[PDB]
Design a protein around this motif. Structure first.
Motif, PDB file in Angstrom:
ATOM      1  N   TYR A 154       0.765  -1.234   0.000  1.00  0.00           N
ATOM      2  CA  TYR A 154       0.000   0.000   0.000  1.00  0.00           C
ATOM      3  C   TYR A 154       0.799   1.288   0.000  1.00  0.00           C
ATOM      4  O   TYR A 154       1.905   1.355   0.534  1.00  0.00           O
ATOM      5  CB  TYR A 154      -0.909   0.011   1.218  1.00  0.00           C
ATOM      6  N   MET A 212      -6.891   3.554   5.163  1.00  0.00           N
ATOM      7  CA  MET A 212      -7.277   2.343   5.876  1.00  0.00           C
ATOM      8  C   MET A 212      -7.330   2.580   7.371  1.00  0.00           C
ATOM      9  O   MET A 212      -8.076   1.903   8.082  1.00  0.00           O
ATOM     10  CB  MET A 212      -6.335   1.198   5.545  1.00  0.00           C
ATOM     11  N   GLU A 253      -2.993   5.348   1.105  1.00  0.00           N
ATOM     12  CA  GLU A 253      -3.862   4.197   1.301  1.00  0.00           C
ATOM     13  C   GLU A 253      -3.809   3.706   2.744  1.00  0.00           C
ATOM     14  O   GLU A 253      -4.845   3.364   3.308  1.00  0.00           O
ATOM     15  CB  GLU A 253      -3.491   3.072   0.339  1.00  0.00           C
ATOM     16  N   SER A 299     -10.694   2.252   9.748  1.00  0.00           N
ATOM     17  CA  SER A 299     -10.537   1.282  10.831  1.00  0.00           C
ATOM     18  C   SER A 299     -11.179   1.770  12.121  1.00  0.00           C
ATOM     19  O   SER A 299     -11.394   0.986  13.049  1.00  0.00           O
ATOM     20  CB  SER A 299      -9.061   0.988  11.087  1.00  0.00           C
TER      21      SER A 299
END
Lengths: 197, 197, 197, 197
Positions: B183, B191, B187, B195
């Motif tokens: 990644y 993420m 990214e 999360s």
């Protein structure tokens, strides 16, 4: 594929003595990456070729302070990379120097219309390393209000024609008009504030 | 115990003319101190040994601005220490230069997969002080997209074998693969945002 | 119209050997652009004319740390442009160097009355590029407490008399008194805090 | 009264060839202005006297990254003024260089007890301007863990005995013990956090 710089540091760029291809004749003010930006082009010195260099910009103008004091000639700093290191140039070919206009810029409230009456001089100072001797030198130029083109954009000068990254200096000073907002950055932000429901 | 630098400033490091041990052949992108980092190794010039030096990095690439303008060759700043002074080097032995990829980096959204199609050139410029004369010089190198190794790590080159801090240049250009997230930093942060419960 | 700097970099300014027009005899503390500012004037070296230069300022004084330690001569940094690049000068004509007093300044709590008992020395260091040779030099000066004038303002030295941007050095060292708040910047901010209803 | 620097820039300081009065033999860690500070003293080169200079500091040590990678010799930046310009020195007489330990410092969690087992080398690099020629030079030194004195303070070296600002070099390397908190800065802040009711 063809590379601009070889592994050993050799630059692969294909470029009279009168120093006229050092700085573009005009500066421009138009949009780049979503920001109204003051731009001018730098190339090189024909009699003393440089690869490395540092550039700085000063805004010279007369003004009256809020205290009523008239400053015949005041110098205002124009950020051209000191806050990123972008002012430390790699002159492999011409470069379009950018001054992103914001609240910290002396041009924060410079609009297309105010240009008509405004009076100033954007002085550019480049201190570069002559490749041949290794010693330092300096080149300067200036852009008065009538040499700053609102709504203009520089023509590109770099291309690839048969494994050669070429620089077309016949387009070094060339600019073209593009649809550009007439508002100053301050005004744009003022309009952004009033746009909030 | 053995020291790298004596009290008087003498360095205690035990190190052909072809300048090939100045910059590592490849650059790498892997994890260091919890951050995905772009790294390359710098050593020294065989014909002009330096102790002090300043390093800068530029990302060269073609791109289309949000305004639709195509920039044949644009230069983007790659932070290698200007915000810490880490760019002012002490060349006692090879050094792994680090560019911590973040939202301010041109490589913010560079992932392992995007590498396949991406096209760029990371140019490195080192201006150092030749120990023997005291005068200044410059060395440059370049890393095209195919010379940037995702998931790789540099082998260490420094050791101590009998009171001597040794530099093994046979491992100067050597790298090895390590499990690395594919990644891009953007990214990773995207993420991280998703999360949150 | 007349310009200060020609397109080719030539400056259009019309200016004994004793170096006395390099730094103004006194420094002043008065209002400029809504801020109490420490100011002094810089011109040039008569025997080694410079165009480019870097300036720095140190506050020298004796003081007792909160730990009870007496420092016979301590040096405190006086910001004169390192946070803007304004310290990288363009010496086209005299310049009024400004130190905007704020919470980061050693002069944050310097008031007109405290001046009477205060004891210090503002040292100025200018390292400039001699135009004729291209080599570097340095000039220094100092302002003791009795040479810092509270409530004073520098007379302007630049004018335009027949297409010539003239510098009147007979007014280089000249200052005049202006109504100035006697309060220190800290006090001004203290009064701002207590002004909130 | 007597001044350290005359109006013309002449310094009024009254100071063998073996370069041993350039850097203090030891560094110290003690309180100054409410902050635990790493300090060392700089004087000058006996064979090449400097007035101006830039100083930088690197922390050399072996370490294992969170990724499990062992770095035989890693260099960590030790802020000695790059964020104020305090690293641009005015060598009128000896100076106590200060590294204020904070969360950005590699020494953030260095305590008196951890000193016993810790292993490192604080390298100091000073590049100064030799007054006599005008050319540049460099001096370096190093402080291993056993040369960093916790709880020590440098003796003052400047005084005024009959209109002469004197430097006593017999006290250049001298330090004395003072009651100093054994805690690391991180610990101090950890204790500050737990002190909140």
């Amino acid at each position: 594929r063809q590379r601009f710089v070889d592994k050993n540091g050799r630059c692969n760029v294909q470029h009279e003595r009168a120093e006229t291809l050092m700085f573009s004749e005009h500066a421009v003010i138009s949009m780049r990456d979503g920001k109204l930006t003051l731009m001018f082009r730098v190339g090189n010195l024909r009699n003393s070729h440089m690869v490395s260099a540092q550039i700085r910009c000063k805004l010279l103008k007369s003004r009256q302070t809020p205290e009523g004091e008239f400053l015949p000639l005041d110098q205002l700093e124009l950020d051209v990379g000191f806050s990123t290191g972008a002012d430390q140039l790699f002159l492999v070919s011409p470069l379009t120097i950018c001054h992103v206009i914001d609240a910290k810029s002396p041009f924060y409230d410079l609009s297309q219309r105010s240009m008509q009456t405004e009076q100033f001089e954007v002085v550019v100072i480049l201190e570069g390393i002559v490749e041949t001797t290794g010693m330092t030198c300096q080149a300067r130029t200036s852009y008065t209000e009538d040499e700053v083109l609102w709504g203009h954009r520089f023509f590109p000068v770099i291309s690839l024609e048969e494994g050669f990254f070429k620089v077309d200096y016949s387009q070094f000073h060339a600019t073209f008009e593009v649809p550009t907002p007439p508002y100053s950055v301050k005004e744009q932000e003022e309009m952004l504030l009033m746009s909030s429901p």
